[PDB]
Amino acid sequence: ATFEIVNRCSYTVWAAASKGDAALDAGGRQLNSGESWTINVEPGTNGGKIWARTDCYFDDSGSGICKTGDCGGLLRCKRFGRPPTTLAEFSLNQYGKDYIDISNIKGFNVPMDFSPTTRGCRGVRCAADIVGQCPAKLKAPGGGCNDACTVFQTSEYCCTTGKCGPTEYSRFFKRLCPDAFSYVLDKPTTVTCPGSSNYRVTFCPTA
């Protein structure tokens, strides 16, 4: 499937795409304001994520570090990144359908729109100024707004053991972006699309 990744932000971002134990396509790439990157994602991919990384630097070797979403110091991501990271999540060709969603379960760093470029389903977007309204305890020193589990690391926040409900910190994300998961047990905000759809992930959407 084709995923078009577009950086409409005023700042540069380093896009990343991985399935957890491998890169998707080249796995990562710098994206100056205005640039786009078209990747190919194998059908059948389950558990894929796309995210943006901010404030990175790398050497000629592709080794370095990012302030948000670092994936083990690499430019070309093989694994998932460190929070806070707004996430575009997808599982494709699962019994004939594609399932997509945006999650704030690992915090938020950059606003995002995740929409199909094919017919048959709606997109999801989280573009409120979450960073700007982020509760004091959640603010990431490197920028971004952490989720509460990352910060507090307690069952109440992590759902370490099934039982968990919303908290004031989850509700904060939820209020600002109702279409994105705000906690593990949040009521699903996943969109079902026809199998083999194509998508566009835009950072800092304007519409």
* Residue 58: partners with Cβ closer than 8 Å, 6 or more residues away: 64, 65, 75
* Residue 150: partners with Cβ closer than 8 Å, 6 or more residues away: 83, 84, 106, 107
Distances (CA, A) of 198 to 4, 49, 91, 166: 8, 15, 12, 33
Domains of the chain, start order = 1-207 (2.60.110.10)
DSSP 3-state of 57: strand
Tokens of 89: 């999540």
Which residues are bridge partners to 58 per DSSP?
Answer: 64
Experimental method: X-ray
What is the rounded CA–CA span in Å between residue 120 and residue 110? 27
